[PDB]
Structure 1
């Protein structure tokens, strides 16, 4: 069923040359996850998939960067000394890795990449960056990174020109090609995409500005019974909203089931799923054959012991059973990198969805959203909240969206401008 686009093939063309590192970027719904899987199968290489957080690793079927490379937590300057206490099997695993795939690369502080480059050089006893391991990075540039602690910020400041992954010092020694996936498979909305590009590039016209002014509506934005999902900055506001609407009447509780070794921070579901008939909910996984995807909304119609029946917004009724997330780790089998399960957790793939945070809805899109203007805006945070919808028309705002709420991220605009001018390549050329 998959389409192989020209941009996808162009990435495959680049990684044939084992010396090419590649940054694959694109908005939500542009096929990043789907193409990552195809990339693994067609690469012809022993791949390891890693991500900066536990939930992202679980979702992409890989491991966290910190566990894979024994990275200590906290900022790391070039001259902090690394213990390098790799077990023998980890060393042999890393020595067979020909292709490192890092998902959600925009969440990766640049010192983590340099620490990875340093550990691999130690393991390969090599001066080549990343010990010569080819690196392919997936993520959306313009999704804001985790706010770097004040401590972290000024330690790394003495060594780093900025706090994005591409500020890693290793990129003064190697570089990477960039390919953007621009086909949004779910829908094709040129005007909305154009507004979004103009907001993030700080090139908004006065038309777009009032196009943005219209999105306000105090009636809809204060209602919680309308298939609009409330998108809020703060987790506390979202907890209150989903608790208020859930209420205390006729609530059933379903407990997560853990088997063996599962990191607490990697758990991708509710620990205690509290629901009730009529509760607004969101699907957390994709199962194409039962016809639900990560992000789909619905209303709870029936509650049983092993089955929650939900009427999705598209008119369908689905019988949700418990889903099992597998905690995997990589290993060798006749010098070939394979996976092995070391634990799992099991739970219905549903969560309360009258509201959701910006953070929890990263990489997701909805038909209808309500933006709770969160005054004291930051850089990019308006673009991020509008990016959670599929059209301009499904967006309703708390208050009026004003020009001063558009806070650009000039480091990202300069990065794009720089690579698009130098042949879709950043860093040192070999």
Structure 2
């Protein structure tokens, strides 16, 4: 039983073939309105998002899954690493509209990599292969994570590190609408404080509403979720729950060469009945995708049985990761698998990073924000909850947790003064 704000009506006919970027405060109804348009579109829509949890929340898959995109940045001079199977092309030409939720965490070059890969399959110079595309997200929440060495690599090509700095907006553009009804939260004394943490204009008197969060009793269990700034805090929290007793350890097996730096899974996956888990890969067959959460019910020597948040029981077998590297063969340069690891594609999920929690909704969260470092990271971390009564904090909410990004004010200025559009018009 959902409301359609007057703004939501204003969008829809704009699409029936210009592109559109829809933004608005945390819990303004972006991710739900998105779900509703996939029905009322008449177009074959394919849904993807930068991270698996947000993707699961929106219906679809990660952007790297969808477009077979390797991890590192991709320049105009870099060669496309991966080719598409004939299924994934079927998926992409049959696609009429592409969606992207939590667009704010998407690097500029991802879009250009998606641009190039789509122009290639549609055999056209149309931007994106002439595929209408609509973007959901919010710039004043989390930006894309990049690692500085990656950043200078793209400073050679990009005047900025946000999704709108994609070079294909030199060949096309999008409209911009701001949904303005915050649904998820109801107390305005609350709501007013986050809108201000969002736009960097909050005062230490409004921050004194958030005094209650410091040091409240754990009413569990209905149990709490822990969302953190760093994985260090994540791994400790879940080891703290779960505990040392009644445990089953499952060790990774690693064929040859695969450095512990980039093993994408748990080395020693320790679990007990009733442990809260997340799945890390996609298996269409069984139906698990990377982001879904479950509850573990049956641990045998080689199969882990877990019942998902959606309801269906899965039997997890182990999954194998391959370390493909580039090497020299009979005077040929070729990606040869130099190793492999094999664990169950599961990890503990009583605690997740604030990054993985963007897009989600909760009734009782626990936040660990004493060491924030990204703009809008605090803002995401405490806008997840419907009510304040339901949030705990590891430290007081100080203004040192708010980090403004002035690239974002300029971007609003640019589009708000030019009729809510951005990029080349046609």
TM-score by length of 2: 0.71
User: Tell me, what secondary structure is at the counterpart of 2:381?
Assistant: helix
Q: Which has the higher helix share?
A: 1
Paired residues of 1:221 and 1:398 also in contact (CA < 8 A): no
Check the 8 A contact 1:218/1:399 in 2, yes or no: no
The one of 383, 403, 406 equivalent to 1:407 is 403
Return closer, same or farther for 1:56/1:77 CA change in 2, 3 Å cut-off: same
Q: Is the 8 A contact 1:300 1:311 kept in 2?
A: yes
| CA distance in 1: counterparts of 2:335 and 2:38, whole angstroms | 13
Aligned CA RMSD, in angstroms, stands at 8.1
CA deviation profile, 1:241-292 (whole Å, cap 9, x unmatched) = 2222322344579999999999999999999997768978999999999999
SS of structure 1 residue aligned to 2:363: coil
The alpha-carbon deviation at position 304 of structure 1 amounts to: 13
Q: 2:154 aligns with which of 139, 153, 156?
A: 156
- 8 Å CA contact 1:218–1:398 kept in 2: the answer is no
* Aligned residues of 1:278 and 1:299 also touching (Cα < 8 A): yes
Provide closer, same or farther for how the CA distance between residues 263 and 200 of structure 1 changes in structure 2, counting only shifts above 3 A. farther
Residue 58 to residue 262, structure 1, CA distance change in 2 (3 Å): farther
CA contact (8 A) 1:295 1:365 kept: no
| 1:295/1:364 contact within 8 Å kept | no
Q: Deviations over 1:312-335 (max 9, x none)?
A: 999999999999999999999999
Partners of 1:216 and 1:327 in 2: how far apart? Answer: 45
Moved more, 253-262 or 368-377: 253-262
Give the C-alpha shift of residue 44 in structure 1. 1.5
The answer as to 2:21 corresponding to 1:23 is yes
Given that 2:142 and 2:374 are in contact with CA atoms closer than 8 Å, whether structure 1 keeps it comes out as no
Conserved 8 A contact 2:24-2:178: yes
2:41 aligned to 30, 40, 43, which one? 43
Taking structure 1 as reference, are residues 26 and 176 closer, same or farther at Cα in structure 2, changes over 3 Å only? same
Q: Is the 8 A contact 2:193 2:207 kept in 1?
A: no
Alignment partner of 2:168: what SS? helix
Query: Is contact 1:177-1:425 (8 Å) kept?
Result: yes
Contact 1:277 1:303 (8 Å CA) reproduced = yes
Go from structure 1 to structure 2 and tell me whether the alpha carbon gap of 1:135 and 1:248 turns closer, same or farther (over 3 Å shift). same
| 1:361/1:50 CA distance change after superposition, 3 Å | closer
In structure 2, distance between residues paired with 1:339 and 1:188: 54
Provide, for residues 92-127 of structure 1, a one-character-per-residue CA deviation record: whole Å limited to 9, x for no partner.
653443212223322321111112222333333433
In the TM superposition, what is the alpha-carbon distance from 1:184 to its structure 2 partner? 4.1
**Number of residue-to-residue matches in the alignment:** 426
Unaligned runs of 5+ in 2: none
Change (3 A) 1:252 1:71: closer
**CA separation in 1, counterparts of 2:321 and 2:54?**
12
Contact in 2 for aligned 1:96/1:335 (Cα 8 Å)? no
